[PDB]
Amino acid sequence: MQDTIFLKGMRFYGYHGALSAENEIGQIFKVDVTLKVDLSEAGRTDNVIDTVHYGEVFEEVKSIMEGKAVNLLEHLAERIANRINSQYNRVMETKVRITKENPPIPGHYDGVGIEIVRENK
Amino acid sequence: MQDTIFLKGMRFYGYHGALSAENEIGQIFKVDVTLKVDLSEAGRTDNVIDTVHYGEVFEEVKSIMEGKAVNLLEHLAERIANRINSQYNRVMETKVRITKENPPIPGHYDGVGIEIVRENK
Amino acid sequence: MQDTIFLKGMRFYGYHGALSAENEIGQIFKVDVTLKVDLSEAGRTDNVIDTVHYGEVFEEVKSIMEGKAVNLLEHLAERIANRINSQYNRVMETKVRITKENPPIPGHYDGVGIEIVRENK
Amino acid sequence: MQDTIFLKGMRFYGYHGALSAENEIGQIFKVDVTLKVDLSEAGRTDNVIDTVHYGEVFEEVKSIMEGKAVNLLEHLAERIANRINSQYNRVMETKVRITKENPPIPGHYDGVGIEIVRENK
Amino acid sequence: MQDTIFLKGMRFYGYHGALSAENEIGQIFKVDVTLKVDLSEAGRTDNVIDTVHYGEVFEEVKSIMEGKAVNLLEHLAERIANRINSQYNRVMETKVRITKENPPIPGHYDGVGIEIVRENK
Amino acid sequence: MQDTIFLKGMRFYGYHGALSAENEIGQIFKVDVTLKVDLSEAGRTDNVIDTVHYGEVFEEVKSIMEGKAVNLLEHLAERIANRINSQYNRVMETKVRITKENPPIPGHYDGVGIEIVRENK
Amino acid sequence: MQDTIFLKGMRFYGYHGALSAENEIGQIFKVDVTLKVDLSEAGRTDNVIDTVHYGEVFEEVKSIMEGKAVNLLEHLAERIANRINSQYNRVMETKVRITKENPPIPGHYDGVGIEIVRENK
Amino acid sequence: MQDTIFLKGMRFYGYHGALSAENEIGQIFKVDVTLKVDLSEAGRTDNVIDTVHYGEVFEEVKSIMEGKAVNLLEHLAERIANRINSQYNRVMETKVRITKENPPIPGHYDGVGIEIVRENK
Ligand SMILES: Nc1nc(O)c2nn(-c3cccc(C(=O)O)c3)nc2n1
Ligand SMILES: Nc1nc(O)c2nn(-c3cccc(C(=O)O)c3)nc2n1
Ligand SMILES: Nc1nc(O)c2nn(-c3cccc(C(=O)O)c3)nc2n1
Ligand SMILES: Nc1nc(O)c2nn(-c3cccc(C(=O)O)c3)nc2n1
Ligand SMILES: Nc1nc(O)c2nn(-c3cccc(C(=O)O)c3)nc2n1
Ligand SMILES: Nc1nc(O)c2nn(-c3cccc(C(=O)O)c3)nc2n1
Ligand SMILES: Nc1nc(O)c2nn(-c3cccc(C(=O)O)c3)nc2n1
Numbered sequence A, B, C, D, E, F, G, H: 001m002q003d004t005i006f007l008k009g010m011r012f013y014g015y016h017g018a019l020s021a022e023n024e025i026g027q028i029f030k031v032d033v034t035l036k037v038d039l040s041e042a043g044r045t046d047n048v049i050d051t052v053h054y055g056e057v058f059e060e061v062k063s064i065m066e067g068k069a070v071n072l073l074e075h076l077a078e079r080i081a082n083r084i085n086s087q088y089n090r091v092m093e094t095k096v097r098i099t100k101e102n103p104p105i106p107g108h109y110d111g112v113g114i115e116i117v118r119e120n121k
C-alpha cells in the first residue's frame, strides 16, 4: 500500500531551541507531514468521511509548532506523530520532517533538522 | 523493472473541493503522473508505437481535471489512474499525485494533497 | 535621496475580496513595503533611534492585513501607507505593493495585484 | 502618479511565430501587463467600481493570446495594449511584456521577447 | 552498495522528436545520469584512476544528445546507458532520465519524459 | 520611447578572465541583452522585416562569447554592444549585462559582473 | 553614464543587531553592491588596470560584514560605501543593499533591510 | 528504523580537484549529510544529550571541506563519513553527497558529483 496524504512546507514562527537566545528571539520552522493512508475507498466514494481531512491535520501540527517552546525538534516531531496517529485510526503510519532553515550555526547551508517515521499502533 | 514515463507539474484550473465556496471560485490543481512501463523495446526500435505517447496521457488527465467538479482529490486521482491503466496495457502500474497549492486552509505552506499508486490488472 | 527601508514578501492569510466566496475561504496575500528614509544619521550613529524599526512596521502591516476583511487591495494598501506615514515623520514617502497570488481567476499566472506610492505630508 | 495594477506571469499555449513549424507545434507565451491607474479613489471607497477589475483584463489578454496565430509578439502586445486602453478610460498607459521562453533558437537562455508601453489617448 | 556518481540537469539543444516540426525547430533536452559505482577505493586512494571521470561521461552524453536526431527519448536514453556501461566496467548499473521541458503538447506543465535503469553486463 | 527587445539569461561556456587558470579551465558566462527599438510599426504590420530578429542577435552574442578569450567582461560587453549597434540601425541603444556566476573569488555570492549601455550612433 | 560593476547576493554570517540575543547567536546577512563606473576605457583596452577588480571589493565588504558587530545595517552599509568610495576614484557612486533574511521578527516574509546610495566625493 | 538527522546544502569554498588550475582558483562545493539515528529517546526526553548536535557535525564537515586540498570528492566524502561515524556511536550509518556545481567541464548542467553511504562499525 503506497497511498499517502501529505502537507508540505508548513511554516511556523516558534521559540524552540536548546539555546536561551533561540527561545528569546524565535525562528521559522518548516514542517513536512506525510501520512500512509489507504485512499481507495474515498477514491471510490468521493465522500470526505472516507479519508483524513488535511485541514484538521494542519491544525494539530500548528498547535504543537506554535505552542510551548521545547528544546528539540525530535520532541516536536514526536508529539506531532503521536497526536496524528492517536486521533486517526486510518493513518497506518506518520512521517514528520522538521527543518530549521536558520539555526544558530555560523555557516552557509540550506537547512538543518530531523525526520521521524512512526507507525500507528 | 524500473523504467518509467512521467508527466510533471501539470496544472489545471478546476472547481473540485468539499466546500461550496471552492466549487464556486475554483483553484489550481497540480498533477504528477508516473507510469511504470518497460521501455527497452522502444529503446531498441525508436518506433513511437512501442511506447506510451505522453501527449495522449496529458489529454486523459486534462479531461478529468478540467471536467465535472468532485469533492475529493482521491476521487480525481482514482479516475485518472483507472483511465490510464484501462487504455494502456503497457502501463504495469500508475502513480498519481495531486496537489492543492492553495486550499481553503488558513496558514503558510507549500501545498496539500494525496498520492496513489494503482497496479494495472 | 535614494535611501530606503524595505520589508519584502510579507505573507498573511486573509479574507479580503469583492466576492462572497473569497471572504468565506480566504487566501494568502503577499505584501512588499518600501520606505523612503534618509539613513545617513543612523549610518553615522549606529543608534536604532535614528531610523525606522522594521519590526514595528511589520506589526502595522500585519494588523491591517490580518484584520477586518475589505473588498479591495487598493483599500488595504491605502490604509497601510496612511498608517506608516502617520506614525513616522522620518518616512518621506511610502510604497505598498499587494499581490493576490491565487485569486478566483480561471487561468495560469504568477499573481495579480496593485502598487501605490504615497508621499508623507 | 506611480500607482499601477498588474498581472504577472500569465501563460498561454499558442501558435504565433514567423516560422511554419512554430504555427504547427505551438509554444508557451508568458505575458506581464502593467497598468498605470490612479488608485486613491478606490483606496478611499473600497468600491470595486472605482478601479479596474484584474479578472476582466486577464480575459482580454487571454482572448488575444489564445486566438488566431500571428507572426510577431509585437503584433500581439500591440493588440493587447490597444484593447485595454480602449475599454478602460481609467488606464492612463499600458505596458505589455511578452516572453517566448522556448523559441526555435539553438541555445541556452531563459527567454526572448519584447516589451511595449502605450499611453491611452 | 549505495555509492553513485551523478551528472544533473545536463541540457542540450537537439532535434529529436516523432514530429517533423520538432526535427525542424529543435528544443532543449534535460538529462540526468546516475551511475552505481563502488567509490571506497577512490575514497581511500584519492587517485582519479580509481573512479569514473564525470567529465568523460558528460562528453558521451553530449555526443548522443547533440548528434543525429531520433524519434524517441527511449532510444536516446538506451544509447547513452549502453555507451556508458560499455566503456566503464566500474559502472555496475546506469540510470538515465531525459526530460522534454517544452514538448509540442498544448498545456501547462513542468516537463515530460522517461527514465531507464540499465545494469552493466 | 520605452519599447525594447530582450534576450535574457543567455549562457555560454567560455575562457575569458584575467587569470591564467581561468583561461585554462573556463566557466559559464551569463548574458542579458536589452535593445531599445521602436516596435509600433512591427506591431501594426506583423511583418518580421519591421523589427529585429532575436535569433540573429543571439548568434552575434554567441560568436563573441564562445570566441577568442579576452581578459575583461567590459571588453566582451563592449564588442557585443558595438556589433549590435553596427548591424541594426533600428536599435537606438544597446544594454549588455554580463555575469560571472562562478568567479575565482573565495566566498559565497550569487554572481559578479558588469553592465554597459551604449547608444547607437 | 549608466555603466556599473556589481556583486550580488553576497552572504556573510554575522553578529550585528540591536538585540543582545542577535549578537549572541548571529545570522546570515545578504549584501548587494552596485558601483557606477565608466567602463568604456576598459572595454576598449581589455586591461584590468582600467577598471575596478570585483575580487578586491568583495574583500572590503567581507572585512566589514564579518568584523566587529554593530547595531544597525545602516551603519554597516555606511562603512562599506565609505570604504569603496575612498579607495576607488573610478567609482562615481556606491549603492549598498543589506538584507536580513531571518530577523527576530515573528512572521512570514522573504526579508527585511535597507539600501543606501552614496556618491563618491 | 527510518529516523534521520540531516544537514542540507552546506557550501564551502575549496581547492580540491584533480586539475592544477582547480587547486589554484578553487570553487564552491555543496554538501548534504544524512545520518541514520534512532530519535525516539530524544523525542521522549527533549534532552539534547540524547541525540546528535547538528552544530557539531557541520563543524566536522567544514574542517574537512575547508582544509587541505585533495583530488577527489570520493576522498572528501570518505573522510567525512569516517569522521562522523567515529565520533558518534549513535549514528548507525552516514550518507554524504558532494556536488561540484561549477566544475571545469565545458557544458550546461546543474552539477556533478558523488554520493556515498557508510555504515558505522
Ligand atoms: N506570525 C505569527 N503567527 C502565529 O500564529 C504565531 N504563533 N507564535 C508563537 C507564540 C508562542 C510560542 C511559539 C512557539 O513556537 O513556541 C510560537 N508566533 C507567531 N507568529
Ligand atoms: N484557463 C483555463 N483553461 C481551461 O482549459 C479550463 N477548464 N476549466 C474548468 C471548467 C469547468 C470545470 C472545471 C473543473 O475542474 O471541475 C474546470 N477552467 C479552465 N481555465
Ligand atoms: N495562520 C494564520 N495566522 C494568523 O495570524 C491569521 N490571521 N487571520 C485572519 C483572521 C481574521 C481576518 C483576516 C483577514 O485577513 O481579514 C485574517 N488568518 C490567519 N492565519
Ligand atoms: N491548455 C490549453 N488551454 C487553452 O485555453 C488553449 N488555447 N489554445 C489555442 C488554440 C488556438 C490558437 C491559439 C493561439 O495561440 O494562436 C491557442 N491552446 C490551448 N491550450
Ligand atoms: N547552442 C548549441 N550548442 C551545441 O553544441 C549544439 N549542437 N546542436 C545540434 C546539432 C545537430 C543535431 C542535434 C540533435 O540534437 O539531434 C543538436 N545544437 C546546438 N546548440
Ligand atoms: N558546451 C559548449 N558549447 C559550445 O558551443 C562552446 N564553445 N566553447 C568555447 C570554445 C573556445 C573559446 C571559448 C571562449 O569563451 O573564449 C568558448 N565552449 C563550449 N561548450
Ligand atoms: N562560516 C563562517 N565564515 C566566516 O568567514 C565567518 N566570520 N564570522 C564572524 C566572526 C566574528 C564576527 C562576525 C560579525 O559579523 O560581526 C562574523 N562568522 C563566520 N562564519
Ligand SMILES: Nc1nc(O)c2nn(-c3cccc(C(=O)O)c3)nc2n1
Pocket: F106, F107, F108, H013, H014, H015, H016, H065, H066, H067, H068, H069, H070
Ligand atoms: N569565504 C571563505 N570562508 C572560509 O572559511 C574559507 N576557507 N577556505 C579554504 C582555505 C584553504 C583550503 C580550502 C580547501 O577547500 O582546500 C578552503 N576558503 C574560504 N572562503
